[model samples]
Target: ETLGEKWKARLNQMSALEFYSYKKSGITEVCREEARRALKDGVATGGHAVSRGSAKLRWLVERGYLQPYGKVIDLGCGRGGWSYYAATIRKVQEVKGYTKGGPGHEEPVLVQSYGWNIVRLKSGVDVFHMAAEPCDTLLCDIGESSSSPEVEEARTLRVLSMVGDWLEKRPGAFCIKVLCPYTSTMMETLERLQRRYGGGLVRVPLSRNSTHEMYWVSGAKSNTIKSVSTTSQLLLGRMDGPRRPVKYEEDVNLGSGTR
Candidate 1:
């Protein structure tokens, strides 16, 4: 079946050009074509294969939104593609790529880059597993699995839950890449989280070629702490969550329990 057919047909009846961006990204075309060509050619032929999400991915990195200068973890990392791009191409300080197969998994195929494309030592950034692991930020670009809808939904929920759990521990940021539900879902999720942890959130489409996806920047750990304001306890007590009274002088003198 051709990609985007059902959604595309529904969109055609709509007023505006809703689903064209999805078509323009050519991801369905690209993923299939590249996969087929590589299978037939027995290698990743260096022609149309490119980092489609580089711009969206970089926006999270370059803007210092995705745990800049802190360790980063790529959860459910597929073939280490996004990890490679973000680390080597975008010059992230350090990156750790994680793939789950079973316990104590072995190494996967390592992607080789052109000399110029490989980030050099003079760039002053180390793109390696150790530095980016146990991170303050987690980026999960698991990609569309092409599985049953039921399976996919379960996977999304499971992965998001797992990622959220890990994120709660570090008090950092999160950037997830998925193919369904689009930017509104991202915004809604961030807003829900902001209610729990203020500082709100921002949904950014980082490029012209992006399709039905975006980077949801929620600095769970950072957001909560950063939102600490004077007379803030009163403001937050009204928000629908737990709140403790605070004396301004106590906060000013000790600066404790502000976050």
Candidate 2:
């Protein structure tokens, strides 16, 4: 079998639960340490601050997404960790972190503590309004925290298109954290977009505390497209083929009010 076919066959074998945990299992040793050190340093003030370790941060840097003197924006920025690392460690020109809440949010304190000029936006409502030039990277780590694969898929579809539009006209690296247990259709859509643009998928190992499996779709290149397609199929397709529908009985008892 070709490499792509092999990956597809492998994906067809996974159970929904198994696929959901894939990203959590993709963590690298370096990322693990970065997460450990960040936690140790108490850089994030509260539990609500969504923070990913420096390992993922370093992954972007290593991938050429987080370049020195380039602009970066972290949407769903928990405690502004990505922006923080980019500003201090990578020495980027401008970094902005956007979260849903305002001053009372944990990120503000952490941003202040770091003493960085990284812009902290209260609402992502202004995302499209922001000038795209000078911004070479966009990090969106938003997803549903639900139990149903159907629900997760729907939410991801909505967000993906919005994000796709943002990256469609711009030239930069985009990293989005996506859920596992992806449907075949999801894989197909992601593959198409990756090909249309220039990007690939790399599993960003998560902290031990995290339960979700996630990966980064970084860079703009054909190789990235194949990587995402291969990975998607391997992770989502693990069985004989597409998922079989659950069988259920319909209730025939109809009330006067029921149609």
Candidate 3:
């Protein structure tokens, strides 16, 4: 069963119109009552030094890119900070975090501390295989630490490729963390997302000044393609027969190709 299904009607009752501020020390009553319980024994986000992902996703929510509700999934959810924030602060219906988290970590341990309502957790990165219904919101924070530039672009595109078809007519939004900017592949990816989905690129003032990080935000909008992202292509399909392999002879394959 999903968190939303478990909490079901109760979650709807908990909904509030509060917002999360990175500068705030504690929550106000206008905030959901759950926020207070989460803060009684734990910090409302590690006591201010919030993870970058947390801050960025917070911006995503405030800036109107992601509408956190129903069942939200946080992919590569480091420390499960953003997921926690969504459940507690935003008062979303439910949150299920997918990640490689464990042992003295901020998962089951802090998960209990927060008093969340049955957070169904999972491991592995393949969202395609998930059995739960397509989540209303998808939080993809797959940032590469020090990979090469082209690899980073490929990683970001790979997530887009996975997400492109799975949103399932669900009325919601997604925010993908992109670290490699100005690349042609990313350009096309952003264009496709804005054209298909509704939202656009997002940047928060909290990120480091010299950071290369950028977020690709989009929602499953029913509107036509005439509406596009604030930031806005690729050409193909002339013949389209499963791309003929590359013909490049740039570098040698070490030892005369003798593995």
Candidate 4:
């Protein structure tokens, strides 16, 4: 209803960076005006974006996922409006929203959100906090965090680990939004979740056809997820790649992914 296949193929195939550029492109006149506003306010604060988000949330409500007194977790919670929307349903008990501090963000901390840049650092900190306790639903928006395809894939990998080890614990529902370079790893993870959690990918009708914005909406119990994720392990291949060759350098680089 939102975008036709031709447009879908065009936008979905483009990288996040491309869409970032695309909002400014003349061909996306419909996308440009509001996109200009979004750039002004931020990620999901705009009413246009929030209206689309509300419709997306209605999917959970109709599917019987966002039940009365549900405990929700919102990650990469831009503007926290989505979290606020969940709160509006009067079905929420308590909703935890995470943000890395922004213009309109209430700026509450959820350190488990590790979808950002190499600028900072984490370890045992995120492990226990993420997987230890369980919530009824998880809302993940992997946007504005080092807007590169590699980080997008890496972020999805991070999300899978969270979903498998965490959400599976509580018969949890999830709505994960991703707009990207759409790599194989991301596709593989979506199928992996689909096989276990029982939900499909959807493109919201209100989202612009000129950009890639899709949701993997799903939920599952522990028994449903056999606890499998290729994302859980690290595979750093070669150390022989060119280095900065820093002599007497006190700094050490932790490897993420090379290819």
Q: Which parts of model 3 have CA positions greater than 4 angstroms off? A: 1-50, 89-91, 102-115, 124-132, 219-259
Residues 1-259 of candidate 3: C-alpha lDDT, one tens digit per residue? 2221222222223324211121121211122233335445575432332233554566557656667777778776656657655665444677777765455334322443232553555664445454445777777776563335566667667766666665555547677776554465566667766665666555444443223455766733322122211111011111122332322212110011100
Model 2 agreement with the true structure over 64-104: per-residue lDDT tens digits: 64343457677667556565555554445666777654564
Ten-residue stretch with the least lDDT total in model 1: 250-259
Clashing pairs in 4: none
Q: Please identify which of the two predictions, 1 or 3, would achieve the higher TM-score against the true structure.
A: 3
1 against 2, candidate with superior lDDT: 2
List per-prediction Cα lDDT, in the order shown. Answer: 0.40, 0.50, 0.48, 0.45
The local distance difference test score of model 1 is 0.40
Q: State which candidate has the highest lDDT.
A: 2
**Candidate 4 residue lDDT tens string, 1-259:** 1122224345456678665654333221122355335435654322232323434565455565434247777765644435655655444666666554545433432121111121121211333244435777677765433434466557657766665675567545677665532455556666666676665555443344343455666632222112221111100111112221222211111122211
Q: At residue 34, what lDDT does model 4 achieve?
A: 52
Q: Is candidate 1 or candidate 2 better by TM-score?
A: 2
Distance from true position, residue 97, model 2, in Å? 1.2
Cα error of candidate 4 at position 259, Å: 50
Per-residue lDDT for 172 in model 3? 74
Which sections of candidate 2 miss by over 4 Å? 1-50, 63-69, 89-91, 102-115, 119-134, 207-216, 220-259
Show where candidate 1 strays beyond 4 Å: 1-22, 25-50, 88-93, 100-133, 143-154, 178-190, 197-211, 219-259
Clashes of each: 0, 16, 0, 0
